[PDB]
Amino acid sequence: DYDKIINQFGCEKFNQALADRLEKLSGKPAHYFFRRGIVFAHRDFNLLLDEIANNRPFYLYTGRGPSSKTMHIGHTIPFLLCKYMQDAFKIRLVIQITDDEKFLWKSMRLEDAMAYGRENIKDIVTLGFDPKLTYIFSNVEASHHFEENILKISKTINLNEAIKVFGFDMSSNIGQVGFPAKEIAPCFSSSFRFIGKGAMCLVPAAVDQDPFFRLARDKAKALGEKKPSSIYVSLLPDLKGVNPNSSIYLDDAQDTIRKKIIAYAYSDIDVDVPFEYLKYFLDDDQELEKYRSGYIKGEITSKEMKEKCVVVIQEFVSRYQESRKRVTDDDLRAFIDIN
Amino acid sequence: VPVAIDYDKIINQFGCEKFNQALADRLEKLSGKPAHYFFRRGIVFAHRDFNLLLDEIANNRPFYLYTGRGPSSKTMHIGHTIPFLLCKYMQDAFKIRLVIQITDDEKFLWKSMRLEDAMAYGRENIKDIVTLGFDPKLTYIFSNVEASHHFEENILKISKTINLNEAIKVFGFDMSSNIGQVGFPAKEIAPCFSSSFRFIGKGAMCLVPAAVDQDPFFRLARDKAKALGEKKPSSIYVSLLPDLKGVNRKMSASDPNSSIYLDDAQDTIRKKIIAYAYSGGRKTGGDIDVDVPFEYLKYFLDDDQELEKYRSGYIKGEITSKEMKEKCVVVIQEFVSRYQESRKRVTDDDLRAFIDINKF
Ligand SMILES: N[C@@H](Cc1c[nH]c2ccccc12)C(=O)O
Ligand SMILES: N[C@@H](Cc1c[nH]c2ccccc12)C(=O)O
Ligand SMILES: [K+]
Ligand SMILES: [K+]
Known part of the structure; x- marks a missing residue:
């Protein structure tokens, strides 16, 4: 039930007026994801669409958490959405590989989480993004390039908020607790040297990534940054029709x-x-x-x-x-x- | 009480061992040179596992020093020089490596400051410290903001071993603490492990000269040593110089x-x-x-x-x-x-x- 999922997270329902706008703005028919209800929810997509109408550039941001077996086809969905989006507007894409998050959450040696990280990148690069427009990075290895942002984000978020939004408790490790700042930082143009000074971010994600982004959006003003926009993809079920x-x-x-x-x-x-x-x-x-x-x-x-x-x-x-x-x-x- | 301090109550409230003249004697024999007067005049009063650090030295095993400074806007008072002087000596007496963490992050995370300033102040404090005359060849002084990522692995590993229940019980975090603060102790802990620095021997033991007010970081570091497959750091503690009225033995x-x-x-x-x-x-x-x-x-x-x-x-x-x-x-x-x-x-x-x- 998609209306109930939208209610629980408190984002907006996607609609076909937003697909027309995107079709109008891209001079090509909107990717079928927007047409078939796979993109069902958003925050402020209209505003990202306004950004395109004003011929200002935006950039894409998405991520992947390692945990490697081979990736399955459900995993391709947000990335396909990014490919289409990149190819429609010839815009930049930053992909976060959360080797740290998977290490901090699963019973896992770090070297392995990092090793899975690299394969996931090979798997992700396969979908054919533009190397001159795409930056894919490991958090362990490369989130320090936007360290200043991480700190700044981290300061604006108290434990109270962190717990309420993420469901941390007394047994969460202090890495897990600090991690949301590292997921939020790439939402802001100032995180990357290679991106225009106030470019709007668009974040395609599983709906379940929303809390990072409601939160990022709440802190944007305090941080002097533009609010990212976000769009959500329904998750492809397994064949039995489940997860x-x-x-x-x-x-x-x-x-x-x-x-x-x-x-x-x-x-x-x-x-x-x-x-x-x-x-x-x-x-x-x-x-x-x-x-x-x-x-x-x-x-x-x-x-x-x-x-x-x-x-x-x-x-x-x-x-x-x-x-x-x-x-x-x-x-x-x-x-x-x-x- | 102007100068007189119940050192034993200080030692018990933290769970460390008391220093003794046996350990200074051991330090004299091992370095050949006389023991820094800090050790003789009661200024090094407590320690954890200094006997074991001595055992490393006696075994031709190398060790390194680690200490820290949180940068402030203000000129530091002579009291602040104390643990750094202890290091200068330890370094010269053993021609060993020293790592100095400037916690510009911490000062940013705790104070009403722009990050830019904490970092600026950090850079001045590196000038302030270098002044005391350390060996350029054996001393690494770095900002956490710029440089702690060279040991992000240890930070991450350490972060996994410390839950919120513990982080709070030990550091006094609360609901209004920001999540940078909560994660910060992993960053102070990391330099306790030789692997946090590519240029230090595989498993060289760390020695941390510190204000006792820093113990919780090191008790915790020692508790997570086994978990991380790392040697437990040793720690020695300096009685802080009082203000001129006596009393305020605060670094503040x-x-x-x-x-x-x-x-x-x-x-x-x-x-x-x-x-x-x-x-x-x-x-x-x-x-x-x-x-x-x-x-x-x-x-x-x-x-x-x-x-x-x-x-x-x-x-x-x-x-x-x-x-x-x-x-x-x-x-x-x-x-x-x-x-x-x-x-x-x-x-x-x-x-x-x-x-x-x-x-x-
Ligand atoms: N944490 C996400 C990965 C991720 C990082 N940044 C993102 C931004 C958008 C969507 C997903 C992500 C996961 O486990 O899969
Ligand atoms: N929290 C310490 C800074 C610090 C980091 N690492 C250290 C090691 C030893 C002593 C102090 C430190 C302070 O402000 O004083
Ligand atoms: K930028
Ligand atoms: K090493």
């Missing part, structure tokens, strides 16, 4: 994919996982529409739905692996270089 | 008029001491135990026999309070003057050598 072997991984083979879908995909179009997967990955609106119409009229079977989902997901992973196989460890360096 | 300054500052003119030093220094003298021997001028000498008179001569003479009424004050004036005066002429000669080249982690 192990029923996720679709980025290193799954073509046959592994056809297996997982035929076996586990729950098959009434509001409950149908194969359609839902299609909502997220099938490029063609006229095509997707055929299947929504088709299943609804009973002119298409669950067998056919599964199988169209199969080939679409197969087209996606195959594109991904074709690029992945070619990401050299040299290529990784262009993205993490600050200088 | 009470009534400026009753403290001697590193920028006081010679006549101010005389005026201040003669006017406000509380004396042991009787109405009409002398009461050494409360005599503030003698206490100052205990801290600053680099000559043992001359100290003994004033002590003796005082106890048997052979020396007057005016005379004790007088000698106290000359000693403080010379110390401040040598300090000030040294400050002038400190170039930025001097400074840049102390500041650069690449030197080692």
Whole structure:
């Protein structure tokens, strides 16, 4: 229930007026995420759209927390949204890899969290962001470049707030408690040398990242910075239709994919996982529409739905692996270089 | 109580060991050279595991010193020089490394200050410290803001081992504390571990000369040593020089008029001491135990026999309070003057050598 999720976090409901505006402003149709309700919520997107209308530049900011097995396809969603956004407005993108957060939260040696951090970057670079417009960084290694901001953010946030907003308690470690300043800092242009002096930030994130951003927004004025704007993506469910072997991984083979879908995909179009997967990955609106119409009229079977989902997901992973196989460890360096 | 302090109540309220003359003797044998007068005159009163640091030395194992200063807007008073003098000595006696954390972060995080200022003040305090004349080849002085990231791993590892329950019980944090403050003790703890500095031997033991008010950081550091696979730091504690009325053995300054500052003119030093220094003298021997001028000498008179001569003479009424004050004036005066002429000669080249982690 998406209205209840919006109510709990207290952000705004996304709407199609905002998609039209974005389409109008980009001279190209809004990415289908905005059209299919995958982007369902926001804070101040209108204001970021106003920034584009006034031909002022904005920049994107998103993050990823390590915890490596291979990444699955659900993990690509905000990053795809950033790719489209970068390619539409040829704008800069900063990606935070939270090796520190994963270390501080999970039972994990730091070297491993950092090691997973690097693979996640290789995996993320795969989606083909512009190296001249994208800065991806490890927190452990590189959040000190905006140390001043971290301190400044940290000073404005008392434990009272930290607890209420994040649910810390007497057993939270003092790293966890300090960490939100490191997630908030990249929300401000002053955090990066390579970004214009008062560029607005746009933060595409799982809705569940919101508290960082309501908070960042509350402290912006006190810090003399522009309020970031944010947009939220629904989370792709696993194939059973929920949140192990029923996720679709980025290193799954073509046959592994056809297996997982035929076996586990729950098959009434509001409950149908194969359609839902299609909502997220099938490029063609006229095509997707055929299947929504088709299943609804009973002119298409669950067998056919599964199988169209199969080939679409197969087209996606195959594109991904074709690029992945070619990401050299040299290529990784262009993205993490600050200088 | 002007000079006299119940050192044992201070030692018990913290959980540390008391210093003894056995440890100074051990220090003499091991360095060949005599033990710094700090160790002989009661100024090093408490410690944790100094016997073990001595055992490291005796075992041809290296150690390093670590100490700190939070920068302030204000000129620091001569009291502030005490643990840094102890380091200068320890460094020269063992030709060992020293790391000095300037906590511009802490001062920013705790005070009503722009970060820019804390950092500026930090940079002045590095000039202030270098003045005391350390070995450029063995001393790393750094700002936390610029430089603590070279040990962000240790900060992160340390941060994992300290929960809020503990952070509060130990440091007195509350709901109105900011989250920078709460995380800060990991940053003070980190330099206790040789791995926090690339240029120090794999597992060299740390020795922290400190005000006892700093113990909680080190008790905690020692508690997390095993957790981190690191050697427990040793710690020795200095009794703080009192103000001229005695009493305020705070690193913080009470009534400026009753403290001697590193920028006081010679006549101010005389005026201040003669006017406000509380004396042991009787109405009409002398009461050494409360005599503030003698206490100052205990801290600053680099000559043992001359100290003994004033002590003796005082106890048997052979020396007057005016005379004790007088000698106290000359000693403080010379110390401040040598300090000030040294400050002038400190170039930025001097400074840049102390500041650069690449030197080692
Ligand atoms: N903490 C997030 C990662 C992250 C950091 N910064 C972000 C900004 C936007 C979205 C996500 C992030 C996670 O565990 O996944
Ligand atoms: N909290 C200390 C600063 C400090 C950091 N590390 C230290 C090590 C030793 C002594 C003091 C310090 C102070 O303001 O005094
Ligand atoms: K900037
Ligand atoms: K080391």
